[PDB]
Design a protein around this ligand. Structure first.
Ligand SMILES: Nc1ccc2cc(-c3ccsc3)ccc2n1
Length: 375
């Protein structure tokens, strides 16, 4: 897996991408790695923000599926033409597979003006593929057509500053993490859904009905930046973070992500956040702990300010909990599809000081963990 280490690149706030090839001869494309969706979809027309795009006319192995796909999101959309072709990952396993590909022919607020990627690799399950679950996602195709084991893992390292990481396809690289992996079950194979059973700020329990933590979902998502929390949970978490960091006060807007706060930096004033996840065994949980250096993100994009402005990277949501980069950059994350589970271990590349560290600890006893799932 040494050939796969450090195969992820990107710019701060613009996602992680991996080099891929599509068609014959191979066409090189940078593709966003997204555990939050299930479509392999690439730009196929000269959108002026794109460095490169899939040219179907140049591929001898392209096959038309004679079907369109329309994908709206909250903000905008993407739209495309479904087909198949041969796909490779130059810094992945030495294999070539026939995969479904959405050729994107129209988009709005999908591509990022200024980024170095031209497509998306949805790593989640068939159930949330567009237009329906008959469209087999890339990873399913990879496992069916080769001996590549049914798992992948992600080390997202963070630092517009350049970001880096590793996607290890088909296994686990033990030098990307310290301590032991701890596994939480995949509750259902659609998103990577898991169950949060307890939340603490600075070891202080939030004491909420644990069903609020997973209302209506909790998911692991490499395609989101923030730790997103349901509004009711976010409201309590914010109140508790504010009380923990009394030493200095901040306007309501900052906590709401409506404005930035700037220095010329004190980490100790801010609390650690702990999430307890359902463990592998009846009545057993474990906890993941992140620092302010994960949830307080630098903004370098500030043109009207030559100070160190930060964004509060926890926000409200109506789609459930989203464990985004705020969480994932603390940990080596194993997506163990073979055994319907997700593993977490302290990341060897995570940003920390000399007083506190990201942590993965257990076992703990936690009763009635079933009840924390929304139905
Ligand atoms: N993990 C995520 C989060 C947000 C996403 C939004 C889009 C999209 C589609 C049409 S416009 C924007 C696609 C994939 C996404 N994956």
């Amino acid at each position: 897996f040494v050939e796969m280490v450090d195969n992820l690149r990107g710019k701060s706030g613009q996602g992680y991408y991996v080099e891929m090839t599509v068609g014959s001869p191979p066409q090189t494309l940078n593709i966003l790695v997204d555990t939050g969706s299930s479509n392999f979809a690439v730009g196929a027309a000269p959108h002026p923000f794109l460095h490169r795009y899939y040219q179907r006319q140049l591929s001898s192995t392209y096959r038309d599926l004679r079907k369109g796909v329309y994908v709206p999101y909250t903000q905008g959309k993407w739209e495309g033409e479904l087909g198949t072709d041969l796909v490779s990952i130059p810094h992945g396993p030495n294999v070539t597979v026939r995969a479904n590909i959405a050729a994107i022919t129209e988009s709005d607020k999908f591509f990022i003006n200024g980024s170095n990627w031209e497509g998306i690799l949805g790593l989640a399950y068939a159930e949330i593929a567009r237009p329906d679950d008959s469209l087999e996602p890339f990873f399913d195709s990879l496992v069916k057509q080769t001996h590549v084991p049914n798992l992948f893992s992600l080390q997202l390292c963070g630092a517009l500053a350049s970001v880096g990481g590793s996607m290890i396809i088909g296994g686990i690289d033990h030098s990307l993490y310290t301590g032991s992996l701890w596994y939480t079950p995949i509750r259902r194979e659609w998103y990577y859904e898991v169950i949060i059973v307890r939340v603490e700020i600075n070891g202080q329990d939030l004491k909420m009905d644990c069903k609020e933590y997973n209302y209506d979902k909790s998911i692991v998502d490499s395609g989101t930046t923030n730790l997103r929390l349901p509004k009711k949970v976010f409201e309590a978490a914010v109140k508790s973070i504010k009380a923990a960091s009394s030493t200095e006060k901040f306007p309501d807007g900052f906590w709401l992500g409506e404005q930035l706060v700037c220095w010329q930096t004190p980490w100790n004033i801010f609390p650690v956040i702990s999430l307890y996840l359902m463990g592998e065994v009846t009545n057993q949980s474990f906890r993941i702990t992140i620092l302010p250096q994960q949830y307080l993100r630098p903004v370098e994009d500030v043109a009207t300010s030559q100070d160190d402005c930060y964004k509060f990277a926890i926000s409200q949501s109506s789609t459930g909990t989203v464990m985004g980069a705020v969480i994932m950059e603390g940990f080596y994350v194993v997506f163990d599809r073979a055994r319907k589970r997700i593993g977490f271990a302290v990341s060897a590349c995570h940003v920390h000081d000399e007083f506190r560290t990201a942590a993965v600890e257990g076992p703990f006893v936690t009763l009635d963990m079933e009840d924390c799932g929304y139905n």
